[PDB]
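Narrative progress, year one. The postdoctoral researcher (J.K.) led the effort to move from monomer predictions toward full complexes, under supervision of the PI. The following entry was the first complex the group processed end to end, covering 1949 residues in total.
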Amino acid sequence: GNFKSKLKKAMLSQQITKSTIANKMRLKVLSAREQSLDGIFEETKEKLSGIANNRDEYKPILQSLIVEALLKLLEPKAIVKALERDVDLIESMKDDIMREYGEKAQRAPLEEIVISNDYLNKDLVSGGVVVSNASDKIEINNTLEERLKLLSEEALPAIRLELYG
Amino acid sequence: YGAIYSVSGPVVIAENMIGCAMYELVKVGHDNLVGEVIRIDGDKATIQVYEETAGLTVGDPVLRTGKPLSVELGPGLMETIYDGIQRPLKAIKEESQSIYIPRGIDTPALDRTIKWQFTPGKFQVGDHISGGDIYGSVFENSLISSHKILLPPRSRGTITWIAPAGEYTLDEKILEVEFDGKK
Amino acid sequence: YGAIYSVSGPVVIAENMIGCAMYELVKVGHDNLVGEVIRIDGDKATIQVYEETAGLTVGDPVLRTGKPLSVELGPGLMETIYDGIQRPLKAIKEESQSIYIPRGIDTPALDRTIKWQFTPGKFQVGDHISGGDIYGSVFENSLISSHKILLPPRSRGTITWIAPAGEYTLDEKILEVEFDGKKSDFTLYHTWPVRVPRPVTEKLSADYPLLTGQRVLDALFPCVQGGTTCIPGAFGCGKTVISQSLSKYSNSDAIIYVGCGERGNEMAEVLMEFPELYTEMSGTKEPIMKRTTLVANTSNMPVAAREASIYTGITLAEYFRDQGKNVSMIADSSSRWAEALREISGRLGEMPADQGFPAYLGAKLASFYERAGKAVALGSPDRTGSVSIVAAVSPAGGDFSDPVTTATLGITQVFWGLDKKLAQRKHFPSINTSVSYSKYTNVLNKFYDSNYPEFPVLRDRMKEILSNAEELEQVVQLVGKSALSDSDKITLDVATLIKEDFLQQNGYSTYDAFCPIWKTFDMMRAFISYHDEAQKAVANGANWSKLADSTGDVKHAVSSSKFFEPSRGEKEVHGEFEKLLSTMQERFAESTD
Amino acid sequence: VFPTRMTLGLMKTKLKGANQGYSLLKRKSEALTKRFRDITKRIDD
Amino acid sequence: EQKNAGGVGELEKKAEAGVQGELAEIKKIAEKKKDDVVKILIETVIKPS
Amino acid sequence: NTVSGVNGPLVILEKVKFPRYNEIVNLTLPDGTVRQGQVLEIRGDRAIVQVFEGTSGIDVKKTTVEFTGESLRIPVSEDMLGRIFDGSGRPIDNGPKVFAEDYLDINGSPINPYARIYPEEMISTGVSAIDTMNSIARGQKIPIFSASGLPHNEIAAQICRQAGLVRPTKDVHDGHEENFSIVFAAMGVNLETARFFKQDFEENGSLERTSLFLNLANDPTIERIITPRLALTTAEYLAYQTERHVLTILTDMSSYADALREVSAAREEVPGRRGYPGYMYTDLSTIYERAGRVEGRNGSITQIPILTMPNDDITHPIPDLTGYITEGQIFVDRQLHNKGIYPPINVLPSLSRLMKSAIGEGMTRKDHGDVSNQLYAKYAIGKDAAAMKAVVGEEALSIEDKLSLEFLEKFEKTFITQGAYEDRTVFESLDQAWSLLRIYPKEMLNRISPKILDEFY
Amino acid sequence: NTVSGVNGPLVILEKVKFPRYNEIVNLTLPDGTVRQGQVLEIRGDRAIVQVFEGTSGIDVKKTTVEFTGESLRIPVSEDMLGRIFDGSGRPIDNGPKVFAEDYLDINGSPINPYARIYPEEMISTGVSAIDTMNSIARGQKIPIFSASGLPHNEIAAQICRQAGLVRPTKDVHDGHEENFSIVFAAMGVNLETARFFKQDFEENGSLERTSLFLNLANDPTIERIITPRLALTTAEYLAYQTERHVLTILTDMSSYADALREVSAAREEVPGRRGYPGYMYTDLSTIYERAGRVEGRNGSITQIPILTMPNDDITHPIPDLTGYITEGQIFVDRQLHNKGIYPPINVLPSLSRLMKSAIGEGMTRKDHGDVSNQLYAKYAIGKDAAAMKAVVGEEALSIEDKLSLEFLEKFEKTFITQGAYEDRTVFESLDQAWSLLRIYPKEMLNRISPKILDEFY
């Protein structure tokens, strides 16, 4: 009776090691996959800083980030938070950002760009901008880090299939 | 046509209706989900939308089909599997590569690439015609002519154009009726 | 700040409540009533005010304090009775001269004069610390000095200051924690939101049986520490007697007694009875009281308090759980809490859709339940603490088809019946195997196998005797008796014995103050042995009547078992029952031939 | 007149009591009349 | 039971060796195709998303 | 200020934002009479009031309000006994108003100095079927559940007549030592029966000891609900200040329940299950709150609420909720009444769950709780045996059951039956219990420990 | 960025109308706690949001909102398995990232490719009572209607855990050439129960054959209904693209139904009978649409939903609607659990309506169908015999009834009863059946062709 019972018991403990082998294999494989993914993304943001810190190359990129946000804002004044070197950059192409929104939307040119006195850290993001409503009802968070994070959702299947599919 | 004001649960409410009747079939948003107008309060219409509205937004167009929820009775009705609003299941199985019809995908109520050989009935140019009279027939069975083409009810007049025997598309015309100008 | 918009019942609405949340502690009116913003409708906030209105006018200010409504858990919780909003009832008796809470009168959540002996933790200066780690301990009673002072759930940092051993107040700071800049200074009391489940190191599956002290509760389906239980009531079947009786008889390190929305007489009874009676843990100088922290709400007090009751109560079990104390929480009755919920549903004007009962009702019942269970105590030194929730369920309309019961059975894994017909006949608590289940059973009988007993074998046979009796009784009622098999008669007879000795017991068993597992097993073991010998005896040939007449002496002896108390054999194993088995065997010998 | 709010539960069990009785009692009746017939022919002879 | 007194610790020999080569092919093809996947991520982020 | 509107009997005042909550306002109507109303709710630039006298007469622009500035409170005297009042405490006999020595709140939420000592000493109502089975303790509130098809008003009456004649029986028992006083509140009860209540007090000689508040159905709904609150508050003053044993008899709860129900038909507050308010429980609980031993623990207030089931079932909202707040119940039944029994009391669903603990041997006996337990089990079997007896025949009967059938009738017609004027000793009650039990052997007993039995049987 | 209000679970956020339906939104708190929710309704400058974690405690000005731009979909993958998830599909294992290969809708349909070809080919659960007597072939949806009086979770686990150990045995007989996967969905669950399922699987070595999704009962109701929806979508992808036969175990449909009844508290949508929706049909259907043969048809998605009667009422709205849609039902009764039989499936009213349609050979035998008829009919007769025995006695009973009795006890105690860790393959079950039936002669066996009957008695 007990031979058979203690025997069933250890045959069950035997398949818990199969289950720990199968879980530990699959945990290692997958955690090596995650580590590669965070080196693809890590390299994206080391290149992005490199682009952002060269201001003249960056100038069109900044314009289109703000303009992308304005198409989803659709308010008559927009409040823009930028980096220290990028509030000056915006200022000197105020005319080109509101021009370019009026030619790329139906909505009539933004009447004002409000240059913020609250600034973003290099400690949070690599750059980019926070475009928000005037009364601060809605924010289109169009920062470089926020954008890469959002990108990751759609890029993840593309990359998973190419590498490991 | 209309613009969506609100979407609350499965129900979509849409403003700028100056001509939605309360039996009308409408395609709501850009996803073209099937919907039909239950109630109208003011310029706002109440539509129950029967097909999943996840993806649907407010400010999106509401385009009328221009007629109520109806079925098309045409030829090619035999050896087909349909839905109750009538859309060929069979054509979706081939095309979508999915047995059932998923959200946002729609097809005409019968196949429309099909052509049929129409033979005339007992009418001729300039003769008076009435509802239920046999204007021609189509075979579908080798036992019977399943689709007798009848003049539409709510239609009568004098026939300005009779097409002869020959093969025609469903889209293509064969009859014109004059009944207070071209009917 | 806010200006009162409308006062409808004890519900106050106030406009101009911005930068406010939905659990905020607020002072309501010019009367400064304690209150909480349950919900908000735009600018207009709907606030449940926990003291009554009788003279609060519109347009008086509403001042938000800048933090949620929480409860205070510190030292001195034991040997004192509080309410469900948790203001000391006792302090209220002297100062206001009103035994129960007076209107417009406010008193803070714990006593602010009481001094406690602080002894240092296992931390020193410059040490990294975390939540539920033991920063000290306070000698709180004489039975227990097990009251560990912890760093709160959701706190970490480095301890800037450790004060040395000595006498302090519980307002007099002894600890500074620095996380990123000064986190706050700490004291002996700590605050916890009554709307959140208290953090835990991990939850662990229940596998350690608590003995209820009631032979019947252990016998059919054993209780576990860490579990969930329903006990049916009916509000006139002595449900109170068994609740209070269980509380005394069950043995845990701390016990929390939560009167949800009670008679006021019943609550009064427990307050009186417990220092008069003794513990089985050798408690002295108000024995039981020293072990209990008591939450007292009557139904006649405000409905807000009574909402708040269960939540405060669960947080108290949970606080002690993190210290590594095993807790029995007896909450009585959960149906009265639901009746308070139906009240809130109609006073705010929220939709009821649970059979004329709240929208939220099914989920709130589950949320309370999930906070109970067995766990590895909060903080890293690793202890075992547990909470077993015994929640009484009773009618709120129908017999079991009321919302409350339907929801509770879904979520409970232990259910112990109580039949009304047997209650009126005096045979309570009556556990019916059809109206009872335990899902913990399989891990529990294997636990008792390790402990010594053959327990799993006895369970199956106990079930079989009760089970066939119900079906044979239905043939008896309709057809009658003119015949009923030799075997079938035996089952009926023995099932009567089980009723009388086990199921009936509540001031009828002279020993019942705590009954060991071994003794229960030994008693049931005699019943089952009598059964198998008897059925074999009719089949190998011997009349049913000769068999009754010869068993004779032993049959009475098992009938009388219930009065007997451990006094022979061991301290848990009883010789009269061991003697009984062998004599039984001799009776069978006389009876077959 | 009988209770309106959740009588359903008791009243269902009344039906189950009744039902069990028809089948069982009919089996019992069936068997007694089957015997009765056997005796009839014996007694007559 | 002696093969259950040897069957533990043997879990990790088989868990490591069993993916010893999978974990090398994961890091190998990642360094290769890294700039070419990064360059696609770069375009999406720096032009409207 | 002035009436904006009236919605149902509820009157919608439009007014400026100043009043107290539950503040009395006086409405000046053009007809030579001014009336008082209480703000039921105060809201944003309007208040909804139900006016305490009448229900008609309010006008749009011909009304004036002036705020009294004081919320309703009951002015209390302990000299209020020996006076006849209505539902507002106004005199009907001209002359005896409530008057005051102190002013106390109508809700009794400010004082609430209810003792944390559980019902203690014995109380009887002189009816054997009550006393023995569901034994009354001071401060215990146990409901009288009745049904219509009954002389349910006669049962209430009987208890009112009997209350205070019991008290010398109790002095002797040493479950009373101090004065007994009656506080009597009437809600929606017939004219004839109101004269029966006055007459029962008169006979007893306790007219001086009692206060009568009389409220009919042609007096408003809001005013009906206030009446027991006035009564209750006065009882609390009697119990607390002068350490008296106060019995308030509060009839009819059903009338009280309807009144609550008629309102909320224009309140924002919405009605729950079976159209009853969900805070009906809350309303019952305010009434019920003044009941229990007072602090001084030489006084108490014992409360007897009278409920007639209007539908007859016990799962109807009115009884179902009450039974929960109280500790047990007492069932009167139609069936006994039909045979020709008085007072017809069925005991089978009747149980009081705090009965054993209160009582002890010093004013009862130790067997009082055991002898009661035996009589329920035997009565229960007798009742099932009767039902089976009809259907199948005498085929399902057994020896115990035949004995139980006789027991049922024996008990019903000797034990429960007694005259209106009759009153009963508890010790007497217990010898009659034993007597009925003498027809069964002792081996068949089991709800009594064999020690106890041997002494008294 | 400005919370307007909270009315129960339903949260009103006031921000513009530019979001779409079921777009995830983020409530940013000054507590540093980001909670995601999904918009239920969008209206002009407000949306109504149900937050997955919590539902209250958000400030009305110290909060901001951000819109994700993505409607809720499940990242689905074949490397996702063998891992423990929450009710949103997010690891609690402490494992790596979810991983994606596709993003599939969980709204009710991903691509809906449910065939117009009817069930054949046996799927084995490893429980004798279900497999032989009620044959389930793939694509069929047969529920287990159980009760709270049974241990519903433990039986559910048993079906999973013994399932997929049937499969090497099937591969040899050549029933399955492709693999077997289990998707297990647990709802509103108790903590002990969540852990229990993982431990059972670990023991059998079925862990990496299955994915377990646990939603706990302290987690809000909206998450709970989302849980099976996530599970069902994952399964449709494994079944279509890599062709596998999948058995989906969904417990508890009663908790899902409650959630649906529960949401509505500011909606203008009214429920039907017993408080449960009029549209309760619609919601059931939703789970039901993902179940059937997939396109290509060697893979399938096979569904067994588990429904717990809370009060043993088969006229309770939940089972009735379901029962009409489903292809038969399995009834599990309290009575057998009480005798101590485990599992306690009484096969007395249980039915599979496409019983013949499932069996064949190579995973069944030919003789399967005939036997199913002998055992059901004999068993029913066995129950009837037990009642008759009690009456007549043992020494006055019939031969035919005596046989039927003997069968009842063996049938229960051998066929239905099996151990916790004992797998019952269909081939194994059929042999045990012939031993039981042997006791009857060939003369009393006749719903069996003489061909079979001669092979095996």
